[PDB]
Copies of this chain bind each other. A is one copy, B any other.
Amino acid sequence: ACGLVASNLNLKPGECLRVRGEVAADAKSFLLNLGKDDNNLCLHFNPRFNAHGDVNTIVCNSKDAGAWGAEQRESAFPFQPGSVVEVCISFNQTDLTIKLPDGYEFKFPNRLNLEAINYLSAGGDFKIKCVAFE
């Protein structure tokens, strides 16, 4: 990943992840990956401003052994190019719970059945300024 890569995390259920970054003034999409490794992701958080045929929509997906899963699209989109953004991801057993800047909160099933998150990578037109564990 050509963005931050944090490994050996050992994040456990009941633990929260807070990621604050800065959206590029000319963003077309950015992402946050989480899981065991780049090929086994419990969550691929991809807000596409305008990329891969999407406009102002969030695409969530999983990846099991390199194979992408069935996408889950969200319409809530409180993101603007050129601004500082903060998302928060809660790890639970059966699913994850994502909280956007506007207060919206949604879920993504823990399809892989992970009981600990070890990998995290940032990508796209977005630069991380703070990663906090809690």
Please judge, given known A-B contacts A131-B130, A132-B129, A133-B128, whether A5 and B4 are in contact too, CB under 8 Å.
no
Copies of the protein in its oligomer: 2
Chain B residues positioned under 8 Å from A6 (CB to CB): 4-7
- In angstroms, Cα B5 to Cα A128, docked, is 15
- In angstroms, Cα B130 to Cα A129, docked, is 11
Taking a contact as CB atoms closer than 8 A, the residue among B4, B9, B128, B130 that contacts A130 in the complex is: B130
As a 0/1 sequence over residues 1 to 40 of chain A, the CB contacts with chain B under 8 angstroms (1 = contact) are 1111111111000000000000000000000000000000
Chain B residues positioned under 8 Å from A4 (CB to CB): 6-9
List A80-134 residues whose CB lies under 8 Å from chain B. Answer: 128-134
> What is the chain B residue whose CB lies nearest that of A21?
B133
Chain B: minimal CB distance from A93 (Å): 22
Chain B residues positioned under 8 Å from A128 (CB to CB): 133
Chain B: minimal CB distance from A3 (Å): 6
In the complex, which of the residues A2, A4, A10 has the most CB atoms of chain B within 10 Å of its own CB atom? A4
Chain B residues positioned under 8 Å from A10 (CB to CB): 3
Q: Can you list 18 pairs linking A and B with CB atoms under 8 Å apart?
A: A1-B8, A3-B8, A3-B10, A4-B6, A4-B7, A4-B8, A4-B9, A5-B6, A5-B7, A6-B6, A6-B7, A7-B7, A129-B133, A129-B134, A130-B130, A130-B131, A130-B132, A131-B131
